Amino acid sequence: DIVITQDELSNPVTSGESVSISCRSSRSLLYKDGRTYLNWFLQRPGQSPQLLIYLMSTRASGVSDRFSGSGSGTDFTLEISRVKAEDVGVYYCQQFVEYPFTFGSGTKLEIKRADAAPTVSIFPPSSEQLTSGGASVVCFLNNFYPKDINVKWKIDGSERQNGVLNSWTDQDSKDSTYSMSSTLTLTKDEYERHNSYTCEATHKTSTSPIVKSFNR
Amino acid sequence: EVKLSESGPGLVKPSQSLSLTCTVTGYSITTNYAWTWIRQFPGNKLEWMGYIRSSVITRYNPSLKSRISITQDTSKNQFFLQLNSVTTEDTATYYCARYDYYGNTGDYWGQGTSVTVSSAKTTPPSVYPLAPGTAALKSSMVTLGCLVKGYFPEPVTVTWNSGSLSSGVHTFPAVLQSDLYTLTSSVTVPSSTWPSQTVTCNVAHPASSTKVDKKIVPR
Numbered sequence: 001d002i003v004i005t006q007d008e009l010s011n012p013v014t015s016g017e018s019v020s021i022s023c024r025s026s027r028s029l030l031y032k033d034g035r036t037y038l039n040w041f042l043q044r045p046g047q048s049p050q051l052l053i054y055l056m057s058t059r060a061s062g063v064s065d066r067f068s069g070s071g072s073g074t075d076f077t078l079e080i081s082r083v084k085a086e087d088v089g090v091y092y093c094q095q096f097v098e099y100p101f102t103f104g105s106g107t108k109l110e111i112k113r114a115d116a117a118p119t120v121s122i123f124p125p126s127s128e129q130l131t132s133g134g135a136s137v138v139c140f141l142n143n144f145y146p147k148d149i150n151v152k153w154k155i156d157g158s159e160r161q162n163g164v165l166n167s168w169t170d171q172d173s174k175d176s177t178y179s180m181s182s183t184l185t186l187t188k189d190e191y192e193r194h195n196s197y198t199c200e201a202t203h204k205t206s207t208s209p210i211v212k213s214f215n216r
Numbered sequence: 217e218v219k220l221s222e223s224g225p226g227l228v229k230p231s232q233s234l235s236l237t238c239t240v241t242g243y244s245i246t247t248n249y250a251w252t253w254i255r256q257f258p259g260n261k262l263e264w265m266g267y268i269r270s271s272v273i274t275r276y277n278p279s280l281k282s283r284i285s286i287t288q289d290t291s292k293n294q295f296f297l298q299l300n301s302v303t304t305e306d307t308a309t310y311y312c313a314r315y316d317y318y319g320n321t322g323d324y325w326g327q328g329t330s331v332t333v334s335s336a337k338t339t340p341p342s343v344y345p346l347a348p349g350t351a352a353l354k355s356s357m358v359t360l361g362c363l364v365k366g367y368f369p370e371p372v373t374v375t376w377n378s379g380s381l382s383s384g385v386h387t388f389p390a391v392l393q394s395d396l397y398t399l400t401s402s403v404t405v406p407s408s409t410w411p412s413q414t415v416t417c418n419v420a421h422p423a424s425s426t427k428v429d430k431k432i433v434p435r
């Protein structure tokens with residue numbers, strides 16, 4: 001069948017600038033009727049896809065006039081004039097000339113913004129979880145930029161690497177920031193054996209690591 | 217306008233048959249539109265599965281072979297999807313949509329329904345409160361949160377104060393572990409407001425038919 005390739009963008013872009021997304025087909029999508037069948041979709045985190053353009057250069061209904069497509073029979077381009085923070089998400093292209101209607105791997109769009117430092121919050125095990133024999137310690141690092149971050153846990157001053165599970169969100173559509181939560185999970189008997197637990201975050205917005213901590 | 221809503225069991229044992237329904241409203245399915253099923257695999261790869269049109273025209277993805285069947289019911293106005301002998305390979309989110317001749321779909325897509333193929337048993341989640349252990353620089357913001365741990369399978373929706381509190385909320389992607397999902401959610405409010413005004417988090421796990429509301433109280 002047809003193989004559609006989407007190229008990744010090399011860097012987060014500046015708001016209010018023009019952006020181009022590329023998609024390529026290993027077979028021409030021009031049809032005997034002279035029309036080129038290619039669709040462009042935008043899918044935001046936790047949402048269903050959204051048609052932007054179809055027939056290669058036609059705007060779906062209710063879609064900003066800032067979006068427009070162009071191309072040959074095998075090379076296509078979605079142009080976003082004056083890109084806005086609400087435009088981040090994943091852009092896919094779909095070929096509509098023959099079965100199966102092949103989708104593109106997808107291209108992610110990231111917005112550049114002012115560097116923000118993370119807001120760290122550490123929390124201790126709940127009395128409910130502890131009466132279960134389990135104990136997890138949570139640490140939230142919210143609304144920071146860029147996305148690059150490093151968190152380090154320490155029990156009684158000693159670095160720990162067992163039991164930690166990290167989960168990063170996607171770039172916020174409003175303030176373009178990122179957020180991460182790290183969970184240190186240990187057994188209850190173990191948690192009662194220590195006193196100090198610290199969460200350490202090293203971001204570009206500072207030489208020194210933001211360190212939050214508590215004592216059992 | 218038109219609305220599409222997928223429904224069906226979010227958990228299927230391997231080898232079994234999978235079955236989803238898409239209920240349309242505001243528009244008849246006995247029209248010459250390609251009422252289609254599409255799915256998105258973990259990794260976000262999107263795949264076209266098949267479609268039924270004009271009530272008697274069905275086309276399918278060669279690759280699903282002969283284990284795919286798309287039918288409908290004019291009286292209730294819903295088309296169905298059925299996929300025989302599923303394997304974990306079929307785990308994914310299923311979306312129904314309405315494509316026309318020229319590939320245009322408009323805003324006619326369902327919200328997608330997650331299907332997981334596995335032998336594991338359904339396990340509801342246990343919700344724990346995340347309060348601050350001590351005090352801090354008040355006259356600013358305070359961050360609270362909930363921890364959802366040990367549920368299977370995805371998904372779980374978290375809302376705060378019954379959804380009447382949406383700003384300052386951050387819910388993180390569930391991480392797997394021992395075939396059990398765990399995830400967290402945070403919320404930030406003006407210190408002056410908590411704990412006076414109470415703050416709860418609601419967690420609904422459709423797969424097990426359970427909904428939990430947990431109030432965050434001072435320790």
Ligand SMILES: COC(=O)[C@@H]1[C@H]2CC[C@@H](C[C@@H]1O)N2C
Nearest residue numbers: 031037096097098099317318
């Ligand atoms: C595989 O057949 C199709 O995709 C058809 C043909 C004819 C027009 C356009 C859309 C149809 O579904 N296609 C180029």
